[PDB]
Amino acid sequence: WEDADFPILCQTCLGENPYIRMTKEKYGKECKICARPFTVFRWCPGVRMRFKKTEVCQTCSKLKNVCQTCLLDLEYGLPIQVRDAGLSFKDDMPKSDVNKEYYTQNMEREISNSDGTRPVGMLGKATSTSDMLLKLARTTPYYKRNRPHICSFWVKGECKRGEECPYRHEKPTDPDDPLADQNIKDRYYGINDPVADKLLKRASTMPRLDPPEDKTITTLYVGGLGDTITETDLRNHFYQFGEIRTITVVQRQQCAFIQFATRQAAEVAAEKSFNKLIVNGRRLNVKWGR
Amino acid sequence: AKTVTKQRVESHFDLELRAAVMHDILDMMPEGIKQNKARTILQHLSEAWRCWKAN
């Protein structure tokens, strides 16, 4: 079994009050990943909010670098399928019983040679956190997580304990929703997480800069400039990102147009700049001009 | 890791006699480079024993 200093989970799962209270039990239960005994630390999430507990081996955690309670990545905080693909990451973790046990054993052996600072392996050589991941990343603590279940009594009427229904006495979700039944093991294996496919559809429909037809359209219109900008500042936005050939800063329409010297350089600057090239705070729009 | 009791005394003597042989020469005084026919020097050893016993 394992031995820990404290858990690994996001802020959402981690809590709000400055003084957190969690009780420890050594060899408390079985990591559904490492399959073996782990330590269990149990944290009081919030006022009348469900007490959580550590739910994966610390090595089972340092493997993929995710939350040992919240289950989402610790840098971004999106489904592991997503975060992996956002690094273009492709892990070979084995699945069958004997294969998985052998894998876990040698994995713990190889992780024993670590210093306890960062996940092992490609988890660093994929650390180019793409603005796709940055943008799909949630901003504030979605602290609805520590609300209880649907008090099945209180769903049929029965929850006769007064207000102490152990569970949120609301309308139960229609399990026809794909966001309902995601087997914890599959969510950990990155195996067909419908919430992850939802994040894929969202990060596919989310706005990105468009490509034009002919290669000789190397003029790029940046809409929404304002009169705090300089031509050298538009340059320093798009200058070492390649070479620029010219720039027209339209002050009668508050825009710009970078004629480039490298098409792929133009693509780099503009596509990375789509609505987010924020120098001195003005939302410019990177497109390929007429 | 079970002890050697009274019924495994002969069986164990032979495990260890023929292990010792295989250590002893058929892998530390070879120079039969190929594949040292240890499986056949052990067959001699068992027939040498039968012939001793039968005189």
Binding site: D5, N65, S128 | -
Partner: protein
């Protein structure tokens, strides 16, 4: 420059003066670091003492 202490070594036996302890390092910050990859952590996700 005189005696400064290696900021990554936390077992340091010589009694450092103010600057001899907390002299700041020359250069820029690593942009390749997620905030987690910039922060000082004894554990994987954040230091505990």
């Amino acid at each position: 420059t005189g005696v400064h202490l290696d900021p990554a070594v936390k077992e340091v036996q010589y009694n450092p003066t103010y600057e001899t302890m907390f002299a700041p390092e020359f250069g820029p910050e690593n942009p390749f670091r997620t905030q987690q990859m910039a922060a000082p952590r004894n554990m994987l996700s954040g230091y505990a003492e």
